[PDB]
Design a protein around this nucleic acid. Structure first.
Lengths: 215, 25, 136, 64, 126, 99, 84
RNA sequence: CGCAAGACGGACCAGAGCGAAAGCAUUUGCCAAGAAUGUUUUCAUUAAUCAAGAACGAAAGUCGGAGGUUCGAAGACGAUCAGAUACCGUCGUAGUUCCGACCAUAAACGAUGCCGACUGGCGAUGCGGCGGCGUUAUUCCCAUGACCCGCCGGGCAGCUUCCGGGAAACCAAAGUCUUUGGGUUCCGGGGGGAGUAUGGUUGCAAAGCUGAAACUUAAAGGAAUUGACGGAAGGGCACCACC
């Protein structure tokens, strides 16, 4: 392409979030307006947006990022749905430090809806307030007992819920707080998070369920 | 590395001497 | 030109990708999904000798050239993503990194959040240069 | 494209720089906004309270 | 430039002040006349340098001690911090508390009967 | 004659220890011979912070840190002045420099 | 140790501190005790470093559990040592 | 934005752990093995060190199958230079990965055989056991986990001292030696010629093991001291140095 001012041929569209988030407008995006065998909506669909939770929800922390996908276009609006979540680079780099044990786990699970998800969890040992020793290491069997409890709690919450109730748990991250309560009888833990979620497979398109998440 | 190279020089001379003598009879 | 038809009291955001290494620096601004390019300018477009392409000055001149084209197309604020080369290599940003960021601020763009984006392996293929390293 | 001339006042001298000690290193305060101060390198003899003429304000330099 | 004073100047000035403190003062032109009659100095230019450092030392001695110099006026008030102070008319009195393991140590030594008591913390402070 | 009691390495009670490749020259050396440096800095310099805080869209934001861990061989650590040579009795001091 | 401490008369606090094989004459740290439980009350004898899961004459499911050191009693009414 | 293939397990990671040594770091399961500790269990001298003989043994290399992402001997080119068959750059064969046979070497190092006894002090650290006032978690106590204060085995190490030793550097062993003897295996005899010639033996090959003499020579070597010197580092100086 060597077009004279191709920005003369572009239409701006709006981008709209799912109805859970307290702030529902994402921003604006470009596409080339329709021509023979190349429609505008086919260029707008399947695009990914990555947004800080503090721009979706009013009172929240900035260090969780959510991924959203476009599914259909209505008038000048692009309508979006959930695709995953992650932690910012500078958060994870600040937690990993010397003289501690780091514990990690992962699971594959389905909702009551047809979605197949994969989840990752992390936790770190706690220095006790009287401790005069320099290091806070767990023994190998204590680490194995904690990892089974991470997987046990993390599978329980997804199997009996839909994607609506799953995202409502991830916004405050009640999953990581329940693991942090349960493990204190084995070894005290000080940072605990569901640090990443990936989607592996999903059901048919279902316009009625899409609009139930938007009305 | 002069000693390692003097060792290599002797090995190639011995390989020549091997092939030269064992041809004779 | 044509940005969004709203033009008072609120911002229109883009994403700026800054890739700063030794040898060169890129300034590249995109749509909020990353799929459509708005403009791209580099250190080697501004200077006329290869030594200077990674310099603080060339990076300042590239950032001023990008910020004028943003306002001309109706964008008012930027999110920033910063890269060093990554992989097997050094993963510290090159010398032109600091100059591009202040130059798009001083030329009137509003600043959103900023992120480090360099690619890191959990473990990697064998690095170039042999067992004895590059020797000088 | 073009940018205007700026005038700035010397507030402190910091030391001498270059291969033969040729350039003084100095802190200057802009005369259109008393809050804005930067560091520069100067070729001649310099004294506290001198005024410099800057052909670009946006460039700043450390130890050459 | 360099205005540092050599040991010939600094030693002669100290020995003058040890012997003639009662003659000296802050006026350089009077010190310059005193130093000419209490000592034999070979040069006018050396006499001026000695009276100069003597004038500097008098202005220091008016504030506190100088470690290389001594005078009766400063020694007799040191001798008044020596001997006994005006601070108190009696000792700090022997009515002081005792810990349970010191009470037990005194019990085995056939003593006690004049001290109050209390216990420390439940576990060693961290 | 022997120069150091530890042979210039941390290895005691072990046979083999894995190598690493240096951040300057990609030479190959043991993980416990390599000289360590962990650097934590702001993304924005102490001169530039004021110019970037005033153009910010937010009423409150805190600029992020950059984290990098570096590894050197003896030749790079000496040439880049990370370490200096020391007096025969001063070589015994294991405490890091003052702040 | 000073230059002149006599070796024939260690105090009982010097002797109780050291290892069983390194005392002046050898002696074990283990002991025999008599043990009693609720529901059936026939008293029985146990060794403090037992390896067996002991069952009482009262036929209860466990009197004590074995362990890497001393065995642990199931909250029984006695841990009393026999004197000799 | 999405797909495919082969290699690798960062940060946490330490004078920390395990193994006869070579060596050993994503998750979960299965198979056989092991040190230390606890013990008022059992046999009752069954032990220590070893010609002959035997198992394991980094990387590179050889033979027969499969795979081939990254890196890269030989090789083709661009630079640098008096030349540059090199150091620096672009490309790339064998190899680098897996399976089945060979090979037996290394600064294979603590440059320091194994077993047993005795001779100073101090603070930490990993494992098992013993005792104790509090704080914290689960259920409401009890028991048990994370922390805190001591003691005992045996482990990788550290600091200190006129134990004592040594040519010294240094060493709690490299000590208990002319005041010379606890047991036992291998092995050195001034520097070169030389790990060479010749015979034997093992191997597909490369090569491994065993191994001389004629002749030649006044020193070769170890630890430490004072200078001089460095394309080593840190302070300071000079118009016979520079701006």
């Amino acid at each position: 392409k060597k077009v004279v001012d191709p920005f003369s041929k572009k239409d701006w569209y709006d981008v709209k979030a799912p109805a859970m988030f307290n702030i529902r407008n994402i921003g604006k995006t470009l596409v080339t307006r329709t021509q023979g065998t190349k429609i505008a909506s086919d260029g707008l669909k399947g695009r990914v947006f990555e947004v800080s939770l503090a721009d979706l929800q009013n009172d929240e922390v900035a260090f969780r990022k959510f991924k959203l996908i476009t599914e259909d276009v209505q008038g000048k609006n692009c309508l979006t749905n959930f695709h995953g979540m992650d932690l910012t680079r500078d958060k994870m780099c600040s937690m990993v430090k010397k003289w501690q044990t780091m514990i990690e786990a992962h699971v594959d699970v389905k909702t009551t809806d047809g979605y197949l998800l994969h989840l990752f969890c992390v936790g770190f040992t706690k220095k006790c307030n009287n401790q005069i020793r320099k290091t806070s290491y767990a023994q190998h069997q204590q680490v194995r007992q904690i990892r089974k409890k991470m997987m046990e709690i993390m599978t329980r919450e997804v199997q009996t819920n839909d994607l609506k109730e799953v995202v409502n748990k991830l916004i405050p991250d009640s999953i990581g707080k329940d693991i942090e309560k349960a493990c204190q009888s084995i070894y005290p833990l000080h940072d605990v998070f569901v640090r990443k979620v990936k989607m592996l497979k999903k059901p048919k398109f279902e316009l009625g369920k899409l609009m139930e998440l938007h009305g | 590395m002069r000693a390692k190279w003097r060792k290599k020089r002797m090995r190639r001379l011995k390989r020549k001497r091997r092939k030269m003598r064992q041809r004779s009879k | 030109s044509l940005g969004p038809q709203v033009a008072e009291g609120e911002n229109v955001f883009g994403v700026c990708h800054i890739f700063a290494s030794f040898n060169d620096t890129f300034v590249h601004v995109t749509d909020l999904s990353g799929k459509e390019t708005i403009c791209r300018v580099t250190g080697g477009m501004k200077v006329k000798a290869d030594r200077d392409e990674s310099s603080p000055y060339a990076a300042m001149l590239a950032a001023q050239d990008v910020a004028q084209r943003c306002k001309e197309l109706g964008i008012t604020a930027l999110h920033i993503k910063l890269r060093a080369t990554g992989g097997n290599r050094t993963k510290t940003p090159g010398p032109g990194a600091q100059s591009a960021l202040r130059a798009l601020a001083r030329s009137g763009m509003k600043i959103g959040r900023i992120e480090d984006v360099t690619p890191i392996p959990s473990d990697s293929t064998r690095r170039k240069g042999g067992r004895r390293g590059r020797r000088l | 494209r073009v940018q205007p001339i700026k005038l700035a006042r010397v507030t402190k001298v910091l030391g001498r720089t270059g291969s033969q000690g040729q350039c003084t290193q100095v802190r200057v305060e802009f005369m259109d906004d008393t809050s804005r101060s930067i560091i520069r390198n100067v070729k001649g003899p310099v004294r506290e309270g001198d005024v410099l003429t800057l052909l670009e304000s946006e460039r700043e330099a450390r130890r050459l | 430039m360099g205005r540092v004073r050599t040991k010939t100047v600094k030693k002669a000035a100290r020995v003058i002040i040890e012997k003639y403190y009662t003659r000296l003062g802050n006026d350089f032109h009077t010190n310059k006349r005193v130093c000419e009659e209490i000592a034999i100095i070979p040069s006018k230019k050396l006499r001026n340098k000695i009276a100069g450092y003597v004038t500097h030392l008098m202005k220091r001695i008016q504030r506190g001690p100088v470690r290389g110099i001594s005078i009766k006026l400063q020694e007799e008030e040191r001798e008044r911090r020596d001997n006994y102070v005006p601070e108190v008319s009696a000792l700090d009195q022997e009515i002081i508390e005792v810990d349970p393991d010191t009470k037990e140590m005194l019990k085995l030594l056939d003593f006690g009967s004049l001290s109050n008591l209390q216990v420390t913390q439940p576990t060693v402070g961290m | 004659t022997k120069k150091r009691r530890n042979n210039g390495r941390a290895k005691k009670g072990r046979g083999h220890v894995q190598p690493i490749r240096c951040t300057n020259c990609a030479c190959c050396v043991p993980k416990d011979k390599a000289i360590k440096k962990f650097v934590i800095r702001n993304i924005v310099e102490a001169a530039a912070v004021r110019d970037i805080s005033e153009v910010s869209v937010f009423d409150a934001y805190v600029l992020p840190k950059l984290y990098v861990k570096l590894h050197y061989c003896v030749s790079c650590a000496i040439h880049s002045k990370v370490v200096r040579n020391r007096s025969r009795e001063a070589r015994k001091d294991r405490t890091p420099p003052p702040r | 140790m000073p230059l002149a401490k006599d070796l024939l008369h260690p105090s009982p606090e010097e002797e109780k501190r050291k290892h069983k094989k390194k005392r002046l004459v050898q002696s074990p740290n283990s002991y025999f005790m008599d043990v009693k439980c609720p529901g059936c009350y026939k008293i029985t004898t146990v060794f403090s470093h037992a390896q067996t899961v002991v069952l009482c004459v009262g036929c209860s499911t466990v009197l004590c559990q074995p362990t890497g050191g001393k065995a642990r009693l199931t909250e029984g009414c006695s841990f009393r040592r026999k004197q000799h």
